[PDB]
Ligand binder design. Structure first.
Ligand SMILES: Cc1cc(N)c2ccccc2[n+]1CCCCCCCCCC[n+]1c(C)cc(N)c2ccccc21
Lengths: 390, 150, 48, 150, 150, 50, 50
């Protein structure tokens, strides 16, 4: 039994706990604005202030800053719950708070908001979880690489003893391309220098100089009122000076047309790469899913490679088994005493398993040492049953 | 570890007392060892290529990784990485009336990427629906395209 | 003989299992020395 | 101004090629954003000294420094100690003498923020808004009727 | 900017608006739906945590003083009091484990003198582990504190 | 300097990785000292000069 | 260790190569190490037996 009570018991690393402080991020579809995302961040702020007073001490919303990266698509609210005494129940506690909260955002909305216990742990090591990445080892571009990642995400979900796999955040939004005919430019009489620092200074911004304000030196920025650069028709408004002291429109030398690029190009180890955050199956656990993901990436096109308790214990414990026998013969010479004590090991450990297999615990870090401490008391108990009796 | 730092940091006080040809070139501070060990040859047999094609692929897939990998002080390259090479003809420059300063300036204008802003700008008007990035000039790609510069 | 061998930690499970053994392994030698110096002496001194 | 393709090979790639020959290192990564902002992450072996490990990356970075747009050079290049995980996130609001979500971000970043980052080994500070700046909104119609450019 | 033929003075004001505003309007903070800014102190790879944030004196102690009208400090997302609690619930554990042992000692040893030796034995051993782990570089970690308890 | 020695003009893109653009001249117009005269520079008054 | 690491060296640079491209090893320190260990561990055992 003892074995079966252990092999079947799942293995975590460290337990996620209510911290009196959690958070929840936002993410809008292809190229949403600051005004559209701010509408969502309000709805999130509210569930917390109205439908969770007895709980939420204070929020701290932030429009335009994800933990994927940043931009007008993203967001994040920083919560700060009311102390644990005034907040007694299991429903009051964070596991249940980020449950009906996540339920609400996947119900009365039209985008993506979640919520999570701040993984006390470190960032890494969720356990029964992953971090894959799809490198382009050959001359392929971002466009052909993308399609191979679609075929990876597809084949895993097409034949998942499953898996739950999704991309990280390359949405893939369009971009307003502006071709400048170079022959035409100089025929009308304009330097390409003057044209570029018109478009870059007007729509994007430009660090001109530094000025002084109330002691501290700050910066001077040049751009333009919002309403003359909100859409593609406003490009024509800008008239550049031409050599022959007279104005010239953009439309003259321009060429307006949209395109399909991506708004974030990740690169792993000197080469292009798009990362894939999947998890272990609801049945399987890591080492299975990991080596059952490498075989799917090996069935992808050419020029597309990849790169990503613990196995720890097996060895660590091995030396536990070797130093016992030494110390069980540094004061107890025979080959009789060094096999006595040897039995109290799973005498007690069967119950250690059983107490935590019965209740809601797992094989985490505290358990792994709650074992070895239980074995040190098993030594105790027995060793006296021997030392005295010999 | 520290001994490198000290030389490579007080070096970068002299850095702007240095030709701009040399600044945009490779300044370097490394850990010396006049003594190779692994000198991995890389040849071709079937799909034949030259002593130039290989030096490029070596230095565009392998070399970048090696130097970084497992504390390699510095890597040596036995050839050169590829580069868009241009062989200016002087007689053909004369019969149109031109200099090598005009070819150089033509590449420092047409062959470049530029920072163009975005629709639905950082401070927009409340209630805009769209937000996408502008593209402008682009860094060139092939031989062909470097042949069609004005 | 079972704690210090598992105190041979690894990777991100470093201190983790380490501090676990050592902390209490230290506490073993301090409990032993006390059970070899103080707890003895005191037990003589004044037990009954 | 730059987009996800511009920064990806004028700032991003230039560093990645010139980011080698360093002691202890498993991998590097990158994020070339469309806002015109790239941030690379080098991860070292466990128990490696973070003091020296910064130096090495931030010094061989500054050989690539002049292979980098002058817009980006005069902007903020940085090398710091990472910790994807805040702890003290001190909110700062107004009640009586009312001011906006902009007035506060300036005073925060003109009295407090400068001190914090330095104070008691703070890897890097985050700012929830922006420090003030002499802003100029160029009108294009008023540029045309006097005959002028930006 | 210019002086048009008839001595009409073209100014920067005429061709463009000029207001003192943020250098970057990409992000905005609303503390409970009310406008505000602040600070997000991120840690340093290797820093002392409850020491960086516990220092101070500071933090921002001499930044909670000369503030103008209405400006006040407020604390969301804060690590601090979780430390304050885990120490307090383990030092509670500790004392409970003594008292509870002191009963079992009496229940078997009717001698009061005798329920006193083991009570006054482990108090010392605990401190030794603080003296030993301090000498080995370890801290009062979440771990080392359950190690007192275990 | 651009003709006989070479010159780092700019950087272009080739198959993902950014490389460099170099300007110089065919070998046969810079092998010996007599080839110096071949190069005619433009002078202010729109006309060539040896 | 530098040269023994790997796995790597260039292990995942001996794979996607196009037509004809192959690796080959001149001037290599490695097998001299492999030999001096083997001739001393041989020495060792001979000195026991003898
Ligand atoms: C660059 C650099 C340069 C050096 N020339 C250097 C020289 C020595 C040590 C570190 C060094 N580092 C880097 C070092 C900063 C070290 C902070 C260390 C630990 C503090 C106390 C632990 N500690 C213990 C247990 C036992 C001792 N007998 C003891 C003796 C003296 C000092 C400390 C001690």
């Amino acid at each position: 039994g003892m074995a079966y009570l252990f092999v079947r018991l799942p293995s975590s690393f460290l337990p996620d706990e209510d911290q009196g402080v959690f958070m929840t991020m936002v993410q809008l579809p292809a190229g949403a604005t600051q005004e559209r995302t701010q509408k969502v961040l309000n709805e999130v702020t509210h569930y917390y202030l109205t439908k969770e007073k007895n709980n939420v001490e204070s929020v701290f919303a932030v429009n335009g800053f994800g933990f994927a990266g940043r931009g007008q698509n993203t967001g994040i609210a920083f919560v700060s719950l009311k102390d644990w005494a005034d907040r007694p129940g299991e429903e009051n506690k964070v596991e249940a708070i980020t449950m009906r909260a996540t339920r609400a955002f996947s119900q009365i909305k039209d985008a993506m908001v979640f919520a999570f216990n701040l993984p006390a742990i470190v960032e890494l090591g969720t356990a029964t979880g992953f971090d894959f990445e799809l490198i382009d080892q050959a001359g392929l571009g971002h466009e052909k690489l993308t399609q191979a990642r679609n075929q990876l995400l597809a084949e895993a979900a097409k034949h998942p003893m499953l898996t739950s796999v999704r991309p990280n955040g390359l949405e893939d939004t369009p971009q307003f391309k502006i071709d400048i005919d170079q022959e035409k430019a100089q025929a009308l009489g304009v330097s390409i220098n003057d044209i570029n620092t018109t478009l870059g200074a007007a729509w994007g911004g430009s660090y001109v100089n530094d000025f002084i304000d109330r002691g501290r030196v700050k910066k001077v920025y040049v751009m333009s009122e919002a309403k003359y650069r909100m859409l593609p028709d406003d490009i024509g408004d800008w008239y550049v000076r031409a050599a022959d002291g007279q104005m010239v429109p953009f439309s003259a030398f321009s060429s307006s047309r949209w395109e399909y690029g991506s708004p974030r190009l990740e690169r792993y180890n000197g080469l292009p790469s798009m990362e894939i955050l999947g998890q272990a199956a609801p049945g399987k656990s890591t080492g299975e899913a990991m080596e059952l993901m490498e075989q799917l990436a090996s069935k992808l096109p050419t020029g597309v490679g990849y790169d990503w308790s613990g196995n720890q214990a097996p060895s660590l414990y091995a030396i536990s088994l070797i130093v016992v026998f030494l110390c069980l013969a540094a004061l107890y010479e025979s080959w009789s005493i060094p096999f006595s004590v040897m039995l109290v090991v799973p005498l007690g450990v069967i119950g250690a398993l059983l107490a935590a297999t019965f209740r809601g615990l797992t094989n985490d870090v505290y358990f792994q040492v709650g074992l070895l401490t239980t074995i040190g008391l098993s030594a105790k108990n027995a060793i006296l049953i021997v030392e005295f009796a010999k | 570890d520290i001994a490198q730092v000290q030389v490579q940091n007080k070096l970068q006080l002299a850095m702007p007392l240095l030709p701009q040809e040399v600044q945009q070139q490779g300044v370097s501070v490394e850990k010396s060892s006049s003594s190779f060990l692994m000198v991995v040859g890389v040849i071709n047999t079937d799909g034949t290529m030259t002593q130039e094609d290989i030096s490029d692929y070596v230095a565009a897939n392998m070399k970048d990784a090696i130097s970084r990998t497992s504390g390699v002080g510095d890597v040596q390259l036995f050839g050169s990485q590829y580069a868009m090479r241009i062989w200016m003809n002087p007689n053909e420059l004369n019969k149109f009336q031109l200099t090598p300063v005009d070819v150089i300036t033509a590449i420092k204008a047409q062959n470049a990427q530029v920072a163009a802003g975005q629709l639905g700008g950082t401070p927009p008007v409340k209630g805009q629906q769209l937000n996408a990035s502008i593209i402008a000039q682009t860094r060139l790609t092939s031989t062909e395209e470097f042949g069609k510069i004005l | 003989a079972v704690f210090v061998p598992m105190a041979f930690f690894g990777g991100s499970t470093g201190a983790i299992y380490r501090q676990f053994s050592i902390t209490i392994v230290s506490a073993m030698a301090l409990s032993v020395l006390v059970a070899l110096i103080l707890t003895p002496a005191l037990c003589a001194t004044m037990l009954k | 101004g730059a987009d996800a393709k511009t920064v990806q090979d004028t700032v991003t790639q230039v560093i990645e090629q010139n980011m080698n020959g360093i002691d202890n290192l498993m991998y590097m990564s990158s994020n070339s954003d469309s806002t015109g902002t790239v941030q690379i992450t080098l991860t070292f072996e466990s128990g490696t000294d973070a003091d020296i490990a910064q130096v090495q990356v931030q010094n061989k970075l500054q050989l690539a420094m002049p292979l980098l747009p002058q817009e980006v050079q005069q902007q903020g290049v940085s090398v710091e100690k990472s910790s994807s995980s805040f702890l003290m996130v001190v909110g700062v609001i107004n009640t009586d003498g009312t001011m906006t979500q902009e007035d506060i971000s300036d005073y925060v970043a003109a009295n407090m923020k400068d001190a914090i980052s330095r104070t008691s080994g703070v890897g890097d500070v985050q700012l929830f808004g922006s420090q003030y700046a002499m802003r100029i909104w160029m009108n294009p119609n008023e540029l045309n009727k006097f005959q002028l450019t930006p | 900017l210019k002086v048009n033929q008839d001595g009409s003075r073209v100014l920067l004001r005429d061709v463009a608006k000029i207001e003192l505003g943020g250098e970057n309007y990409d992000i905005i903070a609303e503390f409970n739906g009310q406008p505000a800014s602040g600070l997000g102190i991120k840690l340093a790879t290797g820093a002392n945590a409850l020491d960086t944030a516990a220092a101070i004196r500071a933090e921002l102690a001499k930044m909670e003083p000369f503030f103008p009208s209405g400006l006040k400090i407020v604390y969301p997302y804060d690590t601090t009091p979780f430390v304050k609690i885990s120490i307090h619930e383990v030092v509670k554990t500790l004392v409970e484990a003594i008292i509870l042992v002191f009963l079992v000692m009496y229940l078997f040893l009717q001698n009061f003198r005798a329920t006193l030796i083991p009570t006054i034995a482990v108090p010392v051993v605990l401190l030794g582990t603080f003296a030993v782990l301090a000498a080995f570089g370890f801290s009062i970690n979440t771990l080392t504190m359950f190690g007192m308890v275990l």
